[PDB]
């Protein structure tokens, strides 16, 4: 009792995973996903493992999948609750986008922080005035919270 | 007083003075900002510091980044308010498949082009429903509704539009869709297979019906706006166009000029720039549509990441244009009055100091008004 | 019905609406008056951000109510 698009989208994520990203459905809820995204190299999150949770609302197909970081991360586009702006500019969420599109977005976001579009203002304050020390703080959080967490 | 001197004056003035180009006194920016920001001030403790915290966090003096606003004040400077008002009354022409009408609309004069590009906002969802339970004035709009004897579109204005299907066709489609989570679902699903079953064969057939019906149904929403300045050149191949824009939650026109994207895209040539503007509307591949979209309208430097991932352009685009004449003695006059306003009201030894004083004055007005709204409780 | 749309510069416009017009339509009506594509707009009422999909009667916009047109975001 669940649409086919979600099933093949699931299977194609286990069969053909995205490098650096693991996504498998929850044991009790086929619409809940437990995600692990590796910290991209040449980024302050290198060598880290980041736990996320991805939920497909009942209107997921026409709606935008809700995603939240579980691992604590020093990133100007993740608030203190772990929430990410699923930004779509001058357009809305269309069913032409998938789970994998979202997962690639978070991965790309970890490699390109956008302080001029903040979600953690105190963090983005540091990313603009003292980027070299914001990156220094992000690397410290990677060791504290994003190693041996999985 | 040249058309190229007009481009060089507005670009240099927008580059240095930002929002002060619009000629609004800083006192009204602070007053209006205080009106819309009063609720953000903490109610307890030192009200002087609570107000200060909000005034510091304000960006009222940062230039606009609504593209329509940028186009409006670009028109309001090169033509004047009366000339731009008269320019608004003219109608947009849809860019032909190869941009023929646009190239044929640019004689060797001082011309300003205004562009309004639209995205195709056709419905993506459908719903099975009975005529007894279908209220057009309440149900979700921009949506397809399959009733037992009629297939129908409910547009963005709540109007009910018949999709030309017989009652027998709708009866067969209505009864084939049985699964509960397919009752209210999406139209164009890549994962449904017609050979799978009769339900998905019907869901797919309905999708092909709706898709065919709406290539003659007007479902465009205005998505983007910008202007292009084409000065008179003494020869036919020295001609060059300068696109002017700002982008929603992206960049201002001041940043557009600082990164010199106007002159970067001018080096594409008139025929080359229009060709990319034409291929944007005729392509059907999202990767080519996004690539050109990123090349033409993305901030300086982000041409290759602006329309990737979540921001891939999956919707058909339509470019519309309107052209008018620019009198360089009008435009330079309109700009020198802005310089006059700036210098007499916000004097400084350079633009940096003149902008600081403008921001300062706007903050003191916002501070003084906020103090008056919050002293009474 | 009449609502006012005010901006940060003081420029105020009047729109002829119905209590059942959605936020997308009032945005399009601003596009009629100003030539600003609705994708370049944010409408605020009483501090709350007006969302696409909901109506004026939802946020309880009465006659002579003034909306704030924001023309700068992140």
Author numbering:
A (entry chain B): 3 to 152
B (entry chain A): 8 to 384
C (entry chain D): 1 to 74
Task: Copy out sentences from the published article reporting this entry, exactly as the authors wrote them.
Strikingly, the SidE- and MavC-type enzymes, two recently identified effector families from the bacterial pathogen Legionella pneumophila, can ubiquitinate host substrates through non-canonical mechanisms without engaging any of the conventional ubiquitination machinery. The genomic cluster of MavC encodes three effector proteins: Lpg2147 (MavC itself), Lpg2148 (MavC paralog A, or MvcA), and Lpg2149. Taken together, our data show that MavC can catalyze deamidation, ubiquitination, and deubiquitination by using the same active pocket. In addition to MavC and MvcA, the same genomic cluster in L. pneumophila also encodes a small effector protein, Lpg2149, which has been shown to interact with both enzymes and inhibit their deamidation activities.
There is one MavC and one UBE2N~Ub in the asymmetric unit, highlighting a 1:1:1 molar ratio of the ternary complex. MavC resembles an overall crab claw architecture, with the Insertion and Catalytic domains forming one half, and the helix-bundle domain (HBD) forming the other. Ub inserts deeply into the crab claw cleft and is tightly sandwiched between the Catalytic and HBD domains. Although the relative orientation between Insertion and Catalytic domains can be dynamic due to the intrinsically flexible linkers connecting them, the binding to UBE2N may force these two domains to adopt a fixed inter-domain conformation. The electron density clearly shows that an isopeptide bond is formed between the side-chains of UBE2N-K92 and Ub-Q40, and at the same time the amino group of Ub-Q40 has been removed. Moreover, the deamidase active site of MavC is located right below the isopeptide bond and the catalytic residues, particularly C74 (modeled back from A74), can form extensive interactions with both K92 and Q40. Through the interactions with MavC, this region undergoes considerable changes, disrupting the helix structure and forming a more stretched conformation in which K92 is accessible to both the catalytic pocket of MavC and Q40 of Ub.
